[PDB]
Design a protein around this ligand. Structure first.
Ligand code: HEM
Length: 76
């Protein structure tokens, strides 16, 4: 379990072989391997490597779906 700053989390953007990580409510999830997040883009509107806590409100789903993915740390 690591502690990520947002600057560090931005590196995990799913591009050029980098893992795709997303933060939600202080926890960082590894969503690499989810075809929804490959390339670090999520259905046009969303970028990997960010805290998307607020962004979930507009999604056609809730944060429950993050549970299938490893928590790799907390966001500063
Ligand atoms: C932005 C408002 C937004 C859209 C649009 C969106 C769509 C979406 C779809 C259509 C799926 C597939 C449904 C399924 O259960 O398989 C999906 C799946 C996941 N999403 Fe999403 N999503 C939007 C936003 C967000 C945000 C802001 C996060 C995280 C903070 C997020 C996360 C996920 C996760 C995790 C899944 C499941 C992936 C998988 O099972 O492989 N989405 N989303």
């Amino acid at each position: 379990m690591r502690v990520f700053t947002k600057e560090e989390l931005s590196r995990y953007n799913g591009k050029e072989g980098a893992p795709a990580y997303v933060a939600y409510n202080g926890k960082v999830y590894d969503v690499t391997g989810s075809f929804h997040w490959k390339g670090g883009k999520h259905h046009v509107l969303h970028d990997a490597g960010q805290d998307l806590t607020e962004s979930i409100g507009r999604a056609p789903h809730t944060a429950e779906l993050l549970e299938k993915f490893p928590v790799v740390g907390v966001l500063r």
